[PDB]
Design a binder for this molecule. Structure first.
Ligand SMILES: CC(=O)C[C@H](c1ccccc1)c1c(O)c2ccccc2oc1=O
Ligand SMILES: CCCCCCCCCCCCCC(=O)O
Ligand SMILES: CCCCCCCCCCCCCC(=O)O
Ligand SMILES: CCCCCCCCCCCCCC(=O)O
Ligand SMILES: CCCCCCCCCCCCCC(=O)O
Ligand SMILES: CCCCCCCCCCCCCC(=O)O
Ligand SMILES: CCCCCCCCCCCCCC(=O)O
Length: 582
């Protein structure tokens, strides 16, 4: 139209508009105080109301970037607090915004956000609901400069909902706490996937990304024509390139147009897009990106017809390699919603290696005639891992299951830091209780989703303070061999056991007076240290000690003079245990 703000204000709503503007400013001016951002918000909202009333009013013709950039340069302490960034204000708009993007500190040094007591939170919420939500919308956004703004809004509303429901509940904490812990994890996971998708698009390039997308989109929209999926994969590539660059406005419009395109062609893509297409602007694309897989056509041919048997396969492949390979993916992915995306990529990659060496020899048709038998071991490997590990988790519980993984991984990379091992294992455990809950049909996709962030988390840490070549190998390998590389790690035969430290195995009464989470972590910590000291301990020998300890604790956290029990009996435990572990 004639006025951008006016238009955005109208099909967004005053409430949503003010929240997004706050997020946007908090993501650039990460150092300014809350009271300051609220003022800017009010000022931009007022200005916006002016344009809604009269599209010809002053400045209402200016573009969003221009308007956004002029207000940013308004801040007086800009140069004194942000330094270089202030020199951005000296350039012509096109470069000005580009300049601002370059200075968006992805990770500032702000104190960790501490969760206050349920009672102080609930009371604050009742006293002033609005500033309570905005204050935290602000604290989160400033710490996560690249989190796509609208999604952050979606999390804000889920937090408001948890307070509404829980602050009225009889037992506040039993209600609110678990919901908040739930929100945090999903929030941190969403943030990790976002950063990951951008990282991958930079390291491995466009082709790899497009392949991941074709597979993913084909499972989702199995009824769509290949030309339709290619079309969407193309736009999705543009969309994420821009969104990764960090330009919110640019990102938002590309996503909007795409969401618009999909809904208008709704019948030619998926039947399950009905709901999502009914929702308002702000929510369309979010919904679509999360929609359930549609049902695959009941009448689908065998892949071997067009990709193995049919002579002249090499003719179609040489005609246009990636297109053909893309069609392979499309066809294979839409018949297998139960496969993880990387598995599909492994299959596609195997096919490529085959067609490459087979199309350059005597009788092609017979060289690549087998290929589908190449897939079997590839498909079964992740499947066996899934059932083996889920069975085990059903036997032991989440906690005792975490302990098993703990012993297994400490033995494979004893060089890693204990607190790192404890965290990684605990998270591997969660993926276990989250995913083993699903029918075998939705398991592999479930693990892939969660395992991808945990493995990326693991790598980043390790990147900071490297400790094992093996870990570095897997972490720098192709994103398709990442998990398989960690799966292939074997017990470290080299490792020289840590020498005994009396303290490391000394326990007091505090452990009795602690919470579940903290008790476990205390126990789990001693367990990693144990294995590092005697890495040759048998699952049996080890289980023997864990049983004595299990009791030992009990005996002392139920005995009169606890101070000495943990000291007299502790002497015994440690001494005996060492005797049994040689
Ligand atoms: C994590 C996801 O599976 C999101 C999905 C996707 C598919 C292929 C490559 C990357 C991401 C996805 C979107 O990011 C999206 C954004 C705007 C509009 C529609 C969208 O649809 C989608 O399926
Ligand atoms: C999350 C975006 C919306 C802001 C509302 C958050 C309100 C809950 C406050 C708790 C946040 C502290 C994070 C944590 O759980 O450790
Ligand atoms: C438009 C179609 C583009 C898709 C290209 C298909 C390529 C399949 C190869 C598998 C990719 C594995 C990733 C990699 O090795 O880089
Ligand atoms: C200075 C004007 C600030 C305007 C704030 C940006 C507008 C956000 C619109 C996002 C629309 C949702 C699109 C989508 O992701 O599906
Ligand atoms: C499923 C819960 C158990 C936790 C252990 C994860 C086991 C799944 C491993 C398979 C990973 C699928 C991704 C891939 O294809 O490599
Ligand atoms: C904290 C560093 C220790 C590294 C632990 C490796 C993480 C294991 C992830 C691989 C999951 C597949 C399960 C398996 O095959 O073992
Ligand atoms: C040689 C030192 C002997 C002491 C060993 C301490 C035992 C550490 C493992 C504790 C974990 C037990 C598992 C549990 O019951 O939760």
């Amino acid at each position: 139209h004639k006025s951008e703000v006016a238009h955005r204000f109208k099909d967004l709503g005053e409430e949503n508009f003010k929240a997004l503007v706050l997020i946007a400013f908090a993501q650039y001016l990460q150092q300014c105080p809350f009271e300051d951002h609220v003022k800017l918000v009010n000022e931009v909202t007022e200005f916006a109301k002016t344009c809604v009333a009269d599209e010809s009013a002053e400045n209402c013709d200016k573009s969003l970037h221009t308007l956004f950039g002029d207000k940013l340069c308004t801040v007086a302490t800009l140069r004194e607090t942000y330094g270089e960034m202030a020199d951005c204000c000296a350039k012509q708009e096109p470069e000005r915004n580009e300049c601002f993007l370059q200075h968006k500190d992805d990770n500032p040094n702000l104190p960790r956000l501490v969760r206050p007591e349920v009672d102080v939170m609930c009371t604050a919420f009742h006293d002033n609901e609005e500033t309570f939500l905005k204050k935290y919308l602000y604290e989160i956004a400033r710490r996560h400069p690249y989190f796509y703004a609208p999604e952050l809004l979606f999390f804000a509303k889920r937090y408001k909902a948890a307070f509404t429901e829980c602050c009225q509940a009889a037992d506040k904490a039993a209600c609110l706490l678990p919901k908040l812990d739930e929100l945090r994890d999903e929030g941190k996971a969403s943030s990790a996937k976002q950063r990951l998708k951008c990282a991958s698009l930079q390291k491995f390039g466009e082709r790899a990304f497009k392949a991941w997308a074709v597979a993913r989109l084909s499972q989702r929209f199995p009824k769509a024509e290949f030309a339709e999926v290619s079309k969407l994969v193309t736009d999705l590539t543009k969309v994420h390139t821009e969104c990764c660059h960090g330009d919110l406005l640019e990102c938002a419009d590309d996503r909007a147009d795409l969401a618009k395109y999909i809904c208008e062609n709704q019948d030619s893509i998926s039947s399950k897009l009905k709901e999502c297409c009914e929702k308002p602007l702000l929510e369309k694309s979010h919904c679509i990106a999360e929609v359930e897989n549609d049902e695959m056509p009941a009448d689908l041919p065998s892949l071997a017809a067009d990709f193995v048997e049919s002579k002249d396969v090499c003719k179609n492949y040489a005609e246009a390699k990636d297109v053909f390979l893309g069609m392979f993916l499309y066809e294979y992915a839409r018949r297998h919603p139960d496969y993880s995306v990387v598995l599909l990529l492994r299959l596609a990659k195997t096919y490529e290696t085959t067609l490459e060496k087979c199309c350059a020899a005597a009788d092609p048709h017979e060289c690549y005639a087998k290929v589908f038998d190449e897939f079997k071991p590839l498909v079964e490997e992740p499947q066996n891992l899934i059932k083996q590990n889920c069975e085990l988790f059903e036997q032991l519980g989440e906690y005792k299951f975490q302990n098993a993984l703990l012993v297994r991984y400490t033995k494979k990379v004893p060089q890693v830091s204990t607190p790192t091992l404890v965290e990684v294992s605990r998270n591997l455990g969660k993926v276990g209780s989250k995913c083993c809950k699903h029918p075998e049909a939705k398991r592999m996709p479930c693990a892939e989703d969660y395992l991808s962030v945990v493995l990326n988390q693991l790598c980043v840490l390790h990147e900071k303070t490297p400790v094992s070549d093996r870990v570095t190998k897997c972490c720098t390998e192709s994103l398709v061999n990442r998990r398989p590389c960690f799966s292939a790690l074997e017990v470290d035969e080299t490792y020289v056991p840590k020498e005994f430290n009396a303290e490391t195995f000394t326990f007091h009464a505090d452990i009795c007076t602690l919470s579940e989470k903290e008790r476990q972590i205390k126990k789990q910590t001693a367990l990693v240290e144990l294995v590092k000291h005697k890495p040759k301990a048998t699952k049996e020998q080890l289980k023997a000690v864990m049983d004595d300890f299990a009791a030992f604790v009990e005996k002392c956290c139920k005995a009169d003079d606890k101070e000495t029990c943990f000291a007299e009996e502790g002497k015994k435990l440690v001494a005996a245990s060492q005797a049994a572990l040689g």
